[PDB]
Amino acid sequence: SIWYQTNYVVPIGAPNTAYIIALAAAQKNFTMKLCKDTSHMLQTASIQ
Amino acid sequence: TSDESMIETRCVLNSHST
């Protein structure tokens, strides 16, 4: 969860709304196992 | 980046295969 620790403090002339791009990855201690089919992308239309 | 750059870390003797 992301919380405003102080506030987004902006002066005059700079935009009152900004954006955070979150870049997620894994560390070097990361592993995977039990190689399986993916559910994060299901084909629906048949590939012509 | 590291994890004891981040939190207090214990020694995990990690034998997790790649």
Binding site: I2, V10, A24 | -
Partner: protein, 97 residues
């Protein structure tokens, strides 16, 4: 590090690029909630946009620490502090900062 779609609200096709970034704005100075996501890479949600999460689709079990890099994309003159809290699995959604 691939872009984590924490802002996975706009399903609109004209607004799909709004999923890659999320709005820190000027607040009332409390511990206001900016953004929330589960830290599960293989779960249906914000992590499916990642290469980690899509490769987590191809594996059943994962172990190891995850990094989420938060990149502030405001002005150089924009300043402020964020509390980015990873909650261990027992804790619910925290009501406060």
């Amino acid at each position: 590090e691939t872009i984590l779609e924490v802002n996975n609200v706009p399903t609109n096709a004209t607004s799909l690029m709004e999923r890659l970034r999320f709005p820190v704005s000027a607040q009332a100075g409390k511990g206001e909630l900016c953004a929330v996501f589960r830290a599960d890479p293989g779960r249906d949600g914000p992590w499916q946009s990642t290469m980690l999460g899509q490769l987590c689709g191809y594996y059943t079990q994962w172990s190891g620490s995850l990094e989420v890099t938060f990149m502030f994309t405001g002005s150089f003159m924009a300043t402020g502090k964020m509390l980015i809290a990873y909650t261990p699995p027992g804790g619910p959604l925290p009501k406060d900062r």
